[PDB]
Amino acid sequence: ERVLCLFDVDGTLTPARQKIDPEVAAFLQKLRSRVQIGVVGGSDYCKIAEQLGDGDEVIEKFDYVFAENGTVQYKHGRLLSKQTIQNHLGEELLQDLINFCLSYMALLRLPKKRGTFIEFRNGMLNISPIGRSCTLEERIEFSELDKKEKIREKFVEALKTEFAGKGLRFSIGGMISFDVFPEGWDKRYCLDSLDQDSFDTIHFFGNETSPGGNDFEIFADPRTVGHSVVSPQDTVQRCREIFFP
Amino acid sequence: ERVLCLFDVDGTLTPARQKIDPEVAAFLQKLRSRVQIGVVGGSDYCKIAEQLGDGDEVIEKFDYVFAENGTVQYKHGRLLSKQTIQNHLGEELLQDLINFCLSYMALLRLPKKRGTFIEFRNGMLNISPIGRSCTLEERIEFSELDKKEKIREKFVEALKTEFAGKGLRFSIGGMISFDVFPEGWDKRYCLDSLDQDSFDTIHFFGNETSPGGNDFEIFADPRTVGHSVVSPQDTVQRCREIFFP
Ligand SMILES: [Mg+2]
Ligand SMILES: [Mg+2]
Ligand SMILES: [Mg+2]
Ligand SMILES: [Mg+2]
């Protein structure tokens, strides 16, 4: 009777990192006549907003907007207070991590380096050996070397070992960087806030629900009814079979 | 007959990092009936724009806008192509510099660290041991420790020695960082483009014209008639005595 449909963004509602198909967007509003709707994605709010509407339309079109896995939350148009990664980790482990990354990267010799090797976000640290302020052409150059030399994979191996047992998780994505985040700060983070909003049912839809995928944990969590999808059209179809049969 | 008045921003036209007094702004437009007018400042365009008008009004109010010491140029409303620091320095010296900074900072133990330890700009690298993405409260905390421990001063000493003779310059400013930039990329940078615009006279006004100041080089350059000022009101007064006597 009080139902929430909660969607991953990339590959679930939109082409990855691209704008939503207006027909999919159209269905989501129709679905909204039967249930509340939310999104949860690993990217920051500005990226998610850009994919799902013009300006800040996303917070009006969706009942919930969980950016950076729910460390940033919009609830019915309202922004809620955010928790810092330093509050969760503590300053000492945070700096141990930062200094290990600085020390490791200083020894990496690349074709090019730029700036923003460590980006401090709400839900993670983003580590990029080339530097995030590089151009697209520079990204591609690094990506091709990285496939040959496994630069990011080896850095992640050394970090996991060094911080073994200290509650840090790692994910390599895109061309130039990897993510470092606390255990529990995958997509499941958003569920703790959702637990207090009196939903009879929360249906989660994602395209990475297999082990290793970024939807695995929230999909498998007992607080959600999980649904595996392979495309936005599959998502729309599943939602019809369930809510408009 | 073809005259340009070229002004530093901070302490010359406005309170440092603050909005221009509307009366000063008013005089500058009157001055514009007799001469062309330009600004040159070390900060990026967005900061300079914010101090001198609303939105992009600055490029309409001034004939020239030289941001980041002239590595970024607006000329009569038009943005000109910019040169990269890597093009000027070369990739090898640039990375030697970046890796020395990464290696040095990894050994610094601070109360707090965040992100963006190396910010890649158009006219410089900005190095911040705490990380530029810190809060104002965090900035002040670092600033007070830095006065006690001379963290930035000692880092600059080691860098100058290590890159002795290789054409790098350093400036420590504000609370959390220092600037690294190529020789010649002080305010004089903007003069090379100006040399081609057929001015009979270029009058430069600045509040840091003594040795060590960030206006010293452009003030002393033989391509300018230099003027030392101590406040925006002094600037307006000097411009009256010269152009409205
Ligand atoms: Mg996905
Ligand atoms: Mg589940
Ligand atoms: Mg000044
Ligand atoms: Mg001169």
Q: What is the CATH number of the domain that holds B32?
A: 3.40.50.1000
Residue B56 among known ligand-binding residues: no
Catalytic residues of A: 8, 10
Radius of gyration for chain A, computed over Cα atoms and rounded to the nearest angstrom: 19
Question: What is the least distance, in Å, from the CA of A4 to any CA of chain B?
Answer: 35
Q: Please check whether residue B24 touches A, CB under 8 A.
A: no
> Which of A100, A117, A125 lies nearest to residue B118, judging by beta carbons?
A117
Q: What is the dihedral of CA A83, A84, A87, A93, to 10 degrees?
A: 140
Beta bridge partners of B67: B72
B143/B69 same-domain check: no
Q: How far is the CA of A40 from the centre of ligand 1 (A)?
A: 10
Residue B10 known to be catalytic: yes
Same domain? B65 vs B100: no
Please check whether residues A97 and A77 belong to one and the same domain. Answer: no
Q: How many A from CA of A50 to the centre of ligand 3?
A: 39
Q: Is B234 a catalytic residue?
A: no
Does B116 sit within 8 Å of A86, measured CB to CB? no
B224 is an annotated ligand-binding site residue? yes
Q: Both B175 and B88 in a single domain?
A: yes
Which chain B residues touch A111 with a CB distance below 8 Å? Answer: 91
Say whether both B68 and B135 belong to one domain. no
Nearest to A119 among B112, B116, B121 (CB): B116
Q: Which domain holds residue B227?
A: 1-83+186-245
A89: left (phi over 0), alpha (psi -120 to 50) or beta: alpha
| One domain for residues A97 and A57 | no
SS3 of chain B: CCEEEEEECECCCECCCCCCCHHHHHHHHHHCCCCEEEEECCCCHHHHHHHHCCCCCHHHHCCEEEEHHHCEEEECCEECCCCCHHHHHCHHHHHHHHHHHHHHHHCCCCCCCCCCCEEECCCCEEECCCCCCCCHHHHHHHHHHHHHHCHHHHHHHHHHHHCCCCCEEEEEECCCEEEEEECCCCCCHHHHHHCCCCCCEEEEEECCCCCCCCCHHHHHCCCCEEEECCCHHHHHHHHHHHHCC
Whether the Cβ atoms of residue B138 and residue B130 lie closer than 8 Å to each other: yes
- Does residue B148 belong to the interface with chain A, where contact is any CB pair within 8 Å? no
Residues A158 and A242 occupy one common structural domain = no
DSSP string, A17-83: TSPPPHHHHHHHHHHTTTSEEEEE-SS-HHHHHHHHSSTTTHHHH-SEEEEGGGTEEEETTEEPP--
**Are the beta carbons of A99 and B119 separated by less than 8 Å?**
no
| Whole-number Å distance between alpha carbons of A91 and A135 | 32
* Per-residue b or e along B128-161, where b marks 16 or more CB atoms closer than 10 Å to that residue's CB: bbbbbbbeeebbebbeeebeeeebbeebbeebee
CA–centroid distance, A162 to ligand 1, in Å, is 30
Query: Hey, are the CB atoms on A95 and B102 less than 8 Å from each other?
Result: no
Q: Is A111 in CB contact (< 8 Å) with chain B? A: yes
Per the entry, the structure determination technique was X-ray
Do A42 and A94 share a structural domain?
A: no
Could you tell me the CATH number of the domain that includes residue B134?
Answer: 3.30.1240.20
Task: Check whether residue B75 and residue B194 sit in a common domain.
Answer: yes
Same domain membership, residue B196 and residue B169: no
- The partner residue sitting opposite A133, judged by closest CB among B95, B120, B131, is B120
Q: What is the number of structural domains in chain B? A: 2
CA distance A209 to chain B (A): 31
- Ligand closest to Cα of A209 equals 1
Tell me, yes or no, whether B46 and B1 share the same domain.
yes
What number of C-beta contacts closer than 8 Å exist between A and B? 77
